[PDB]
């Protein structure tokens, strides 16, 4: 499935490009988020968001 999906995207881009058109890529659905700061001096809203993201420690990472 992965190989076929990438090949179909390649073909779609080639066909768009060959006629002066464009291929708008699908919006990414998944983000990978890693915390890059320690736990000091965090304001309440940011603290709450990072807790709901389960990013409670530096270099913790989620999808």
């Amino acid at each position: 499935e992965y190989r076929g999906a990438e090949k179909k995207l390649v073909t779609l881009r080639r066909q768009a490009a060959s006629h002066g058109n464009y291929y708008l890529e699908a919006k990414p659905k998944v983000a990978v988020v890693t915390r890059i700061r320690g736990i000091a001096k965090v304001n309440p809203k940011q603290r709450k968001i990072l807790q709901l993201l389960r990013l409670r420690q530096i270099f913790n990472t989620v999808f």
Partner: protein, 197 residues
């Protein structure tokens, strides 16, 4: 470091061993810790939790309350089936206001002497928890019961009595003292009997 803000708020105070010095309570706790670990019964689990509890939290029960609830269960119960064994992890006390009770099987930690006499004279029998473990090892066909604690004097004294909507008793040795300013409209003000929550 990991941000665990007030993680100590989520820790709960639960009794996990008994403060009792009674060796027989300890034997019963052994028996029912084994039964709660090695069986699927919820009855054994709750019996174990109640067995390790403080005496204040094992409120006593009256014989009349047992009889009334066993009657409410007996109707809508097929007359083929036998009455359940009433189980209380606590004390059964006699009741002078109910002379006529049916034959009931009751298991309790302790019976008052007059309660035991009344139960036997009505045709029932008083069980101990080891006999119950022998004949109902998973508590099938039992009625777990708790005594009442809301009528306690300490409960009646809890909270400030001078705030609106409170009807707690004050800590006072002299009943006639503290019947003036704060309790009558003609003495400055009266604490309000009702307040919307």
């Amino acid at each position: 470091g990991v941000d665990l803000t007030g993680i100590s708020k989520k820790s709960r105070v639960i009794r996990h061993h008994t403060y009792s010095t009674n060796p027989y309570i300890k034997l019963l706790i052994k028996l029912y810790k084994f039964l709660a670990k090695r069986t699927s019964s919820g009855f054994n689990k709750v019996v174990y939790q109640r067995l390790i509890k403080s005496r204040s939290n094992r409120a006593p029960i009256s014989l009349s309350r047992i009889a009334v609830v066993m009657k409410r269960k007996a109707v809508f119960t097929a007359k083929s089936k036998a009455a359940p064994i009433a189980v209380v992890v606590g004390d059964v006390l006699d009741d002078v206001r109910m002379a006529r009770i049916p034959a009931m099987r009751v298991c309790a930690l302790r019976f008052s002497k007059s309660a035991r006499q009344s139960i036997v004279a009505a045709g029932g029998e008083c069980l101990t928890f080891d006999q119950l473990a022998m004949i109902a090892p998973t508590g099938k066909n039992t009625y777990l019961l708790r005594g009442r604690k809301s009528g306690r004097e300490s409960v009646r004294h809890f909270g400030a009595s001078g705030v609106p909507g409170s009807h707690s008793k004050p800590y006072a040795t002299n009943r006639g003292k503290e019947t003036k300013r704060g309790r009558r409209t003609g003495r400055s003000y009266k604490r309000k009997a009702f307040r919307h929550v």
